[PDB]
Design a protein around this motif. Sequence first.
Motif, short mmCIF file in Angstrom:
data_model
loop_
_atom_site.label_atom_id
_atom_site.label_comp_id
_atom_site.label_asym_id
_atom_site.label_seq_id
_atom_site.Cartn_x
_atom_site.Cartn_y
_atom_site.Cartn_z
N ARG D 11 6.46 10.51 32.02
CA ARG D 11 6.91 11.73 31.41
C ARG D 11 7.54 11.11 30.06
NH1 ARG D 11 11.10 15.74 32.87
NH2 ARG D 11 12.85 15.62 31.41
N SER D 12 8.02 10.02 30.03
CA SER D 12 8.17 9.49 28.52
C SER D 12 7.20 9.42 27.54
CB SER D 12 8.88 8.29 28.69
OG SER D 12 9.30 7.51 27.36
N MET D 14 4.56 11.41 27.73
CA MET D 14 4.19 13.03 27.46
C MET D 14 5.35 13.37 26.16
SD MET D 14 3.44 14.55 30.93
CE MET D 14 2.83 16.37 30.33
N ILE D 15 6.51 13.05 26.52
CA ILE D 15 7.58 13.32 25.58
C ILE D 15 7.38 12.84 24.14
CG2 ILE D 15 9.91 12.78 24.84
CD1 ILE D 15 10.88 13.28 27.90
N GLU D 16 6.74 11.35 24.26
CA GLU D 16 6.42 10.82 22.91
C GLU D 16 5.28 11.74 22.27
OE1 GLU D 16 6.03 6.86 24.21
OE2 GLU D 16 8.50 6.62 23.68
N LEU D 19 6.46 14.53 20.61
CA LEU D 19 7.20 14.17 19.27
C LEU D 19 6.29 13.89 18.20
CD1 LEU D 19 10.32 11.84 20.60
CD2 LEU D 19 10.37 13.98 19.57
N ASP D 22 5.01 16.89 16.93
CA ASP D 22 5.97 17.69 16.00
C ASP D 22 6.16 16.96 14.62
OD1 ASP D 22 6.42 19.50 18.00
OD2 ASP D 22 8.42 18.84 18.46
N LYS D 23 5.88 15.63 14.53
CA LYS D 23 5.91 14.82 13.46
C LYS D 23 4.91 15.39 12.49
CE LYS D 23 3.96 10.51 13.48
NZ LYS D 23 3.14 10.74 12.38
N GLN D 24 3.87 15.83 12.78
CA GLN D 24 2.97 16.42 11.80
C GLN D 24 3.34 17.62 11.16
OE1 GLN D 24 0.14 13.93 12.19
NE2 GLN D 24 -0.87 15.75 11.45
N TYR D 26 6.81 18.08 10.94
CA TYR D 26 7.75 17.72 9.87
C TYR D 26 7.18 17.26 8.56
CZ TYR D 26 11.91 15.21 8.78
OH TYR D 26 13.13 15.04 7.78
N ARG D 27 6.21 16.30 8.75
CA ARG D 27 5.67 15.76 7.46
C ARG D 27 5.01 16.73 6.68
NH1 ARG D 27 4.78 10.45 10.03
NH2 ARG D 27 6.28 8.96 8.89
N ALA D 28 4.54 18.07 6.97
CA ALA D 28 4.02 18.86 6.24
C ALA D 28 4.68 20.06 5.92
CB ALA D 28 2.94 19.44 7.25
N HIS D 30 8.37 20.81 3.56
CA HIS D 30 8.89 20.35 2.44
C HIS D 30 10.69 21.32 2.55
CE1 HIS D 30 4.70 19.77 1.22
NE2 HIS D 30 5.20 18.65 0.83
N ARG D 31 11.50 20.32 2.56
CA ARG D 31 12.82 20.96 2.59
C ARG D 31 13.16 21.08 1.01
NH1 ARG D 31 10.25 17.86 5.94
NH2 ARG D 31 12.01 16.02 5.68
N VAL D 67 1.01 25.81 1.94
CA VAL D 67 1.80 24.71 1.77
C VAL D 67 3.30 25.46 2.31
CG1 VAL D 67 2.91 23.01 0.67
CG2 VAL D 67 0.58 23.58 0.15
#
Lengths: 55, 270, 230, 234, 127, 340
Positions: D11-12, D14-16, D19, D22-24, D26-28, D30-31, D67
Amino acid sequence: IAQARKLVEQLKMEANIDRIKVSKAAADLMAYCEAHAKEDPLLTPVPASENPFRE
Amino acid sequence: YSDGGCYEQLFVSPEVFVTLGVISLLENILVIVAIAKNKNLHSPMYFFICSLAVADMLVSVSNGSETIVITLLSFTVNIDNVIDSVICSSLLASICSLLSIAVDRYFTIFYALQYHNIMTVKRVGIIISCIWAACTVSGILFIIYSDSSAVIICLITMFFTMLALMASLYVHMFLMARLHIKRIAVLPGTQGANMKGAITLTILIGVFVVCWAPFFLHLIFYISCPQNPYCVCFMSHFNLYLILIMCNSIIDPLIYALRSQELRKTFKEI
Amino acid sequence: VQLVESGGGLVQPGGSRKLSCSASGFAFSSFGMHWVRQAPEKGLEWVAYISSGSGTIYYADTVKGRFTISRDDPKNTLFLQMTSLRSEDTAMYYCVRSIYYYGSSPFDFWGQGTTLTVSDIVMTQATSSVPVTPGESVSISCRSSKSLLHSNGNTYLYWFLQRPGQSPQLLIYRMSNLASGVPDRFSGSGSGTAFTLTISRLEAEDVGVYYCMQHLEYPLTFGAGTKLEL
Amino acid sequence: LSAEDKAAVERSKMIEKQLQKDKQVYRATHRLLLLGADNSGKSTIVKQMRIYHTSGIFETKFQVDKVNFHMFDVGAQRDERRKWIQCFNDVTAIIFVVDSSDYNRLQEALNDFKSIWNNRWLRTISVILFLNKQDLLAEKVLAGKSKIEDYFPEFARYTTPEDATPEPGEDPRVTRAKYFIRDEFLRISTASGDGRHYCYPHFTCSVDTENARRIFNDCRDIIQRMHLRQYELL
Amino acid sequence: QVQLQESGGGLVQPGGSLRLSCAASGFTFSNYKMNWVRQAPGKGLEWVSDISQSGASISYTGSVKGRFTISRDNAKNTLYLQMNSLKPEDTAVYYCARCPAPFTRDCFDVTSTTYAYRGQGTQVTVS
Amino acid sequence: LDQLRQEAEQLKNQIRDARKACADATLSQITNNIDPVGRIQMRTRRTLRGHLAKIYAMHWGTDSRLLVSASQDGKLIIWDSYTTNKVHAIPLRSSWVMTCAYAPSGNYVACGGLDNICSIYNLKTREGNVRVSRELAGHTGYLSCCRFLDDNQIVTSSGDTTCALWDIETGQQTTTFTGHTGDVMSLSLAPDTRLFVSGACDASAKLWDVREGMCRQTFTGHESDINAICFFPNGNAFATGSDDATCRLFDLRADQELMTYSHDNIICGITSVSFSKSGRLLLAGYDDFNCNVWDALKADRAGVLAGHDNRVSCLGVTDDGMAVATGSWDSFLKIWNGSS
């Protein structure tokens, strides 16, 4: 105007507190620390056979 | 170059080869453990630096092993058949790793806002594995079917194309750096960035040229002028050309990996 | 929370059939599903298991070759593809959900079961039948072959209750913990090979058969069951 | 390793995996942080950028050339800023809107810009200036009733910068006035920073339709400069 | 307790001069950048001067650039504002402000409506 | 109106006179003969990885094994510290989270931030997922700290110069505390859960009574904003970190400060303060990339937990007293422990 009155009342309620001498405060803190020192893993490291984090 | 004495450059004590190979092994093992031990650095560029370190280590091991084997000298054709392939595939690996770092940097600069969208980790492994697999295939296929006088001509062209591409990409980076410095310098409130860019280009391109040009030249002369006595002297310093090739792998971390402060501090911990 | 099983009925020996387990009311993907079957007049028995993400599949020895388990998360259905049936496969097949993390409660919901008719640690419950009157406390014992206390502190014993005509319900997981809605009357304890379940004050809705299950290592093995007749 | 512990590890994993997926995103992404006073006009910039392309934070979604851009206008917060401005570290760029027609609050805007620029945590974060309300500034300068020398004495001994690019059919006086304010902001912009971050000025009105493209270009320039400095070509 | 007492106000004719002193107790004076803050009647809250913790860097608003002067005495824990050639637009309540954090070059909330490290104010008025 | 100011000054003078009268001897002088603690060193047993961005808040469980973390990527993660497993991953509606709490019973977690909402998440559901339970919505500023009292009562602190005591089932404020003059940054519930303290960016801290709603005492020793606060295990003292690079110890009955923890080499502000179990150690995180272990009786530095590559923002010591966990802006979370 109301801010001044509220601050005055709060200070009045903060002036009627029964304080104790700093010596008794330090004595109480010292006593607590020396009484519970034996059960503080970070102060007195536990054997590796008992530590959850290295086993 | 040296030529002069038309005698083979056998004035090469395997002690210096062992010393240079050990230094290269230490430096590349140190950089690879620093990369793998710092989880903060897992970007594509550091994976390409990983591949370059592996390739340089393999080059050093191959050269040192071949020299030590000949010095110590079935048991001959069974060893100078794999040590003559891990010395050919590893050259491809080093060249392609250098070009991969150059292209990665070029994509980060000129396609900045889409480099985040497109490729982060999986495609990095795909490309690295493809390059390494194809270079091992080339090394093997340059033993089988080798010595055909067409295998060696398909290696000088690879080197010259890669050199041209690397120089083109890096000059093209420096040009936009100059544009940005021109835009920055025109501001009312206002080492040297131009000088810094010139030094960086000079170091990178000149190291890739000086430390590789004689060797491939040798390789060319081979199928170029196998009879000219001047070409005979140019041939006769193959043992200096290989010491140059090994002088590559001792300064590649200095100019690619050590330049990053994040990786530089990871060396201090180790 | 609901699970419905369909695809039972008669089948000639040597044939094949598929069972479906339709889930609704909970996050199906985060749960790993099981298949427990019960012969017409016998105790429970484990069949198969598929983990969350379908990354871990285990089968029983008796069915390790002819049965296939698979799931389709988007449509919330669990499948069991049966092939080459014999006469020992006649049973009622149950769909059991299970979730595993620190402090979870596996085997917490049991579907109503479908009926199919075809025309290793050992747990023993020597107390086959115990007569008990309301208001009195009764203790039920179960025994193991291997010690169930793992090195991580857990004991890995489960207690189940089966009313006369319903699906099994969880009572105690890991020898001391109590289920979500089970009353505080039920409590359990043990040493590592011998175990006991105690009812503080028996009621009318507490009759049926009680089962002890191990989850220390696959395959999962139940007991014969203890019947409490009033 | 018990069976339940193996399942927990699964399960850990799958959670990773989720994650990492979702990192993709996040890095795509721009804030950007949108800053301005009450008269700044950041609201009309939001309105421009949203139809095209007691809550304490407003998020605005817009997309330029495939973008993704996230922008954050701070809402039901007090006037003190030194504690919640730290949350906006590691953002791509800060967007600063100034009303260039109100001479009285221009010094306040300059002080705010100085505080944003010199903050310890916003030292690697570039600022995109939007010198808003140029029409009002033009109308005020041409109809001379308010003297800029009354608030900035240095305007007397000032000359239009050589690299000025006036809009066609524009008075020299309004060009001088609109470049004086930019010069004041860039003086703070260049006095410190050590080259880690820069200010990108822009003259904008309430009728412009090309501000999202400007932010896209400026973020491209920021990332290009960052990667160039990393590679030591700049 | 961090407190700042600002004294030295009063009536003055146009072209007159005054001096404002700010006694500071409780916050190790030499470590903090200090400012002067002005509030004209019916207006907001303005920033008029700034001095570093050494006395080197000095800034002004511009409307008072050539007339006001700001000094500092780290030994006596005082901040000075030498008003020299006042005009009627200068009438306001003057506040001696402190900057939020030591050793910093950013002063965020010196002009906020309710800022903790600021004085009660001295009233300076011009006929 | 000036007579009000005169009365305020008179009462302030009386308070200062009483404080001077009760200060018979300094804490350091009494603790002169106490055996100094050795050089405490910790060796980063577990490093927890998986957060995409900065980390502002962490909270231990009551069992000293489970652990919540808040990151500005929009994730709350429940960790199993013993195994480094990830139990839960809860995505938040708003990414600008600034605090998190783990309920004493284990059934709920809280989060909040620039979005002024404080959100309670139900962890133990018959459906298997983690759902939002309530959304407390009455704060007019960012929410910097939240701590549970029960499964139905929570206490929050806001940038709005006020703390609150909500009723989770109803969703309405039960008491609002309105004494401060700056942004309340931290919050510490007392062991007995009838009082609590807060430091609020005015160089002051205040003791509140949960039932009544009034400020019991006020402590004004600091120089700049107060960032972290925590109770001594006794419940009669608390330590405070601030932005002027100092930690101070306040006792409630003495109504003073007893000892200031500082060093001339430190010019960085504390961001997190926690005590050990026996109260002999005071751990404080700094902006100079690493934490510090102080001796809360001798005021001598006794350790440095230099392992982070960015600002340390959170610091927790378990109820068992066995581990201390540190989170920083480098998207990591390290669990430290000693060695025999």
